[PDB]
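Hi R.,

Here's the input for the magnesium ion complex you asked about:
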Amino acid sequence: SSVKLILQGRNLEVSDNVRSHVEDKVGKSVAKHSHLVREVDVRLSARGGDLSKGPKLRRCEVTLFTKRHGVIRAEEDAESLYSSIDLVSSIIQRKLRKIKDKVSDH
Amino acid sequence: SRRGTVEEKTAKSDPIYRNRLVNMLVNRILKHGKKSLAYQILYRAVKKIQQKTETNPLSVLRQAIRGVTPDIAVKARRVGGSTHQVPIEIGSTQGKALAIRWLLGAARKRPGRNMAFKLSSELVDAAKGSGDAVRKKEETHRMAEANRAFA
Amino acid sequence: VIHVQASFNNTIVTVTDVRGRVVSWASAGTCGFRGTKRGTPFAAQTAAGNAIRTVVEQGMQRAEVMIKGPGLGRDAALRAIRRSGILLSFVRDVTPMPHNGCRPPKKRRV
Amino acid sequence: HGTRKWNPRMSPYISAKCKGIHIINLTRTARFLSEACDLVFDASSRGKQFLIVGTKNKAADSVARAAIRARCHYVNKKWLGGMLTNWSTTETRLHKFRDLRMEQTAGRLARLPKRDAAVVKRQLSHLQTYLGGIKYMTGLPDIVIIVDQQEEYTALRECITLGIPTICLIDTNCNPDLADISIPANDDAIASIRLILTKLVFAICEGRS
Amino acid sequence: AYNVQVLVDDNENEERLLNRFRREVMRAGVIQECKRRRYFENKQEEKKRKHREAAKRNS
RNA sequence: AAGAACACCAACGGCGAAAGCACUCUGCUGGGCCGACACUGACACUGAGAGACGAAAGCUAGGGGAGCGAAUGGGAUUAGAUACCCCAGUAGUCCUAGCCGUAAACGAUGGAUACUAGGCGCUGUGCGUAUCGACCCGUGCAGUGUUGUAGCUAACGCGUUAAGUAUCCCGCCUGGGGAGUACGUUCGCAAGAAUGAAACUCAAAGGAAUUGACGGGGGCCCGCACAAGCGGUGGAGCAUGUGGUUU
Ligand SMILES: [Mg+2]
Ligand SMILES: [Mg+2]
Ligand SMILES: [Mg+2]
Ligand SMILES: [Mg+2]
Ligand SMILES: [Mg+2]
Ligand SMILES: [Mg+2]
Ligand SMILES: [Mg+2]
Ligand SMILES: [Mg+2]
Ligand SMILES: [Mg+2]
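And here is the predicted structure with magnesium ion in place:
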């Protein structure tokens, strides 16, 4: 809790039901190490189908800057928007847990 | 750096007193790249020290560096174990410049009319035991003897 | 006699006569150290000095040191005992030697 | 050579043995000395070019002088790979090496700097170390002689690859199946070398006519 | 019940006593055997240990 | 006073069908090797069923219980810690009767026999030379290890102790998952062991080796990478860009 959030309509408009789905996922992965991070960067995109040529694909780029010189870069691609958000959140929880295991190595 | 062979700089001396200690003392005063103003801060100070003490200011300056110089310090290390601060000795040149920072550092902090007065009262007080820079020597020297064991 | 027990967490120094009746003692903990600083070799020097200094005043120039166990302070304690005003005959180490007697603990994982 | 060094391959060509040391057979080789000198004498009459491969320190200069008596070729230093097999690269280095001796005659060394002249000096010096006895070959030999099998193991294999008969070191160190012509007893000393080397080099002289 | 003895009475130096004490106890191997007997070791560790000791002494 | 276990000797080591057997002796007792001039006269090999032995763990009674230690508590590390760490600690670990009959019970390699280059050194027991005091040296036999030729092998590697060349006999496999599961049967005090499917489902699963990438693997080195120093940003006010909202 007490962490800001940044969305970005790269190639589309950000709806409200989508915004609720974003906060639900990263809210789980970040609530664990909530006292290490201050902000959450997000950038949603869309391509293909009716917009462009090729398969419909929606990207979700997520960057995270902790309170102690921590940098995370996560980028995945899926056929739907929610599925893209889900896969990235799993990657953040993996690397975000990797940091504590190194700090708590003793 | 990774070379380990730093060139030895040409330690110069002032025109009047012709000693290299004074020139090392001046180079820490300026911060915008001007030397003509530091002497107006210095030559007014050493004259003011002579006005008060009735003796050469050179010995008073040589005594202050002799008293504030700790010749020992503590550095943090965690190559073995977590959060260790064991002592470490200091050379002759390193301890010399190390005392200049503490003197001029305390002079800027303490109140006064000008840097010449703030610097004059610092050296005169620092030479006579009681000085804000001498307190930092005691604090740094305390941490060494406190953590005298290598742990 | 000067029984000394070395270890990684502490170093003990007990003085006693040949008959086995202690007169004085002091360890790194009594000196002021605590935690991991006790096992350091410097603590053995200061701990040994405070225990033997009172003994040199009360005569008994003769002495025998009985080392017991490993540690970093066992060698540093000799410098403390040697840097003194007493002679010595034995520098023997009365350590245990089990011939496969009991079961030791399990190995540590961390 | 010894109880811990005798190869079971030479067992047909062993007669007896002694305290530690080994005794080679001089009977079977005498037939091959005749077959060798008969083939070398017959081959030299047709005008072929031969080669000798000697790099052992004890017989480095002996093989050098051995080649001056005839119009054959020697290899004093190491084999450096692909001498005969990669002949296309060898002609490039020999055409190169042949030219540099003409380069030194010109007065172009004056207009070169100090360091550049040193590289050209050390360049030609390196090729002289390995390309000395080949300067007048101009082609591939037809028979190649091996003085040492162990130290020059690479030279014996390119002959088998290119299909060239050869002479070998059939003493107990090596394998006799590698060369068709077999002459043991050459690892003893220069006596075993010069007695055989001068004998075979001698036969080349009358064969040359 | 002892393991090592040094009957010095007046050494020529303060630090040279360790030369007579360390190397003497080293040949007896008191430090290595106590580290061994601290934690239990299986038959696998014994074979690996004694094998490394031999390879260290042989060459 | 008690219980349990035997440093050093100790390995490139010995014995045993394996599992396994190491502080010392003594008793009873099994097996192997060699020698030779007593003898037997193919009385051999393998082995379905069956039978015996069979690490630890665990079970059924009776004893014992020092130390160590599942479980269970407590103190810490952690977002959490029913874990790793630390302090205490039950069953069990030990003995005598018996059950259980499973392990990476591995040399991941069934047994017997004949043939097939060598090099090193370790035992056991002979022969001969020799100092004939043993030793040493040289060889035979039966074993035990390490390199390695031919040959085999997908490759790694095996290689006179074969994973080579051949014969005889037993067991065993026929894509993966479902599954060593379900039903039934036999044994077992139980825990569970052995025997052992099908429906349905995928077009793979898997082996060796190569190349990169990666590693809280190792070694070395470099950059204002850190450290050290000097001066700023983040706060204030105002330039000016982007988002967002608004239009
Ligand atoms: Mg059966
Ligand atoms: Mg049991
Ligand atoms: Mg099984
Ligand atoms: Mg086993
Ligand atoms: Mg099996
Ligand atoms: Mg088997
Ligand atoms: Mg092999
Ligand atoms: Mg593989
Ligand atoms: Mg820095």
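One thing worth noting: Chain B touches chain A at residues 82 (CB under 8 Å).

Cheers,
M.
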